[PDB]
Amino acid sequence: MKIYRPLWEDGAFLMPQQFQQQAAWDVHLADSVARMGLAHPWGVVAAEFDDSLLPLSRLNATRL
Amino acid sequence: LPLMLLPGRTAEGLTSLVTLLAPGTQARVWHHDRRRIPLKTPLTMRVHHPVSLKSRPVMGDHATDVNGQVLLQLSTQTGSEVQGWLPGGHLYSDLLALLHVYLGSRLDVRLQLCVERSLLPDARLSCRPAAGSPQLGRTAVMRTQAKIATSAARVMTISLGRYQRVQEHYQRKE
Numbered sequence: 001m002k003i004y005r006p007l008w009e010d011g012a013f014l015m016p017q018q019f020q021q022q023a024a025w026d027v028h029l030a031d032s033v034a035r036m037g038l039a040h041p042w043g044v045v046a047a048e049f050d051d052s053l054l055p056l057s058r059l060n061a062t063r064l
Numbered sequence: 065l066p067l068m069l070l071p072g073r074t075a076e077g078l079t080s081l082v083t084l085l086a087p088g089t090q091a092r093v094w095h096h097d098r099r100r101i102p103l104k105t106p107l108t109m110r111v112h113h114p115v116s117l118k119s120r121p122v123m124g125d126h127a128t129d130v131n132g133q134v135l136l137q138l139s140t141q142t143g144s145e146v147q148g149w150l151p152g153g154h155l156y157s158d159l160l161a162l163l164h165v166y167l168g169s170r171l172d173v174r175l176q177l178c179v180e181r182s183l184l185p186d187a188r189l190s191c192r193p194a195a196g197s198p199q200l201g202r203t204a205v206m207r208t209q210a211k212i213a214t215s216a217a218r219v220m221t222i223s224l225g226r227y228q229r230v231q232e233h234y235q236r237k238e
Binding site for chain 1 (some may be wrong): 185186187188189199202203
């Protein structure tokens with residue numbers, strides 16, 4: 001998605017797109033570390049709901 | 065000299081000190097403010113079996129002491145003086161007029177400012193980047209006209225310490 005990491009040497013005006021494109025690159029690097037061995041995308045770690053609210057029907061989550 | 069002859073006074077002399085030094089600038093004082101930390105070195109909320117106390121000392125882990133840290137705002141409208149209050153210009157005028165002449169070790173003084181947007185550049189080298197703690201005046205490439213903002217902070221006019229040490233002798237047995 002055209003990830004552009006900036007460079008700073010001197011005199012550059014700060015502007016949000018240097019920071020937004022920086023932090024997106026660290027995710028994509030950390031993505032490529034995981035896809036070396038496992039060949040799996042992501043998934044669900046923990047998903048716990050509230051059972052006491054069910055017969056009075058609503059649905060509340062606790063940890064997602 | 066007329067103001068420096070009344071003892072233990074006052075708050076209204078700090079209005080004269082600003083209007084003297086650069087006209088076009090006004091001053092307002094808030095007498096108390098929500099100061100923070102001083103972190104107490106024993107946490108003291110151990111609940112004690114042999115001996116404890118109640119009467120005054122009741123808290124959590126960080127204390128709050130209002131008592132002496134007044135807030136001061138300035139308000140300019142000539143841009144030649146906006147670049148005078150950022151550190152280097154007229155900030156050395158107040159910072160020596162307070163600490164040894166009018167206040168000394170009475171109190172601590174917090175400074176603040178409110179202007180229209182800024183005149184502030186960015187990440188150039190060694191020394192003049194910081195507009196106090198914050199940065200702005202670089203991003204509005206959109207709209208023509210004004211928005212009012214607070215500017216920044218300046219440091220307190222304080223002087224303190226502990227020196228290091230423990231002692232060896234005593235006063236007198238009378």
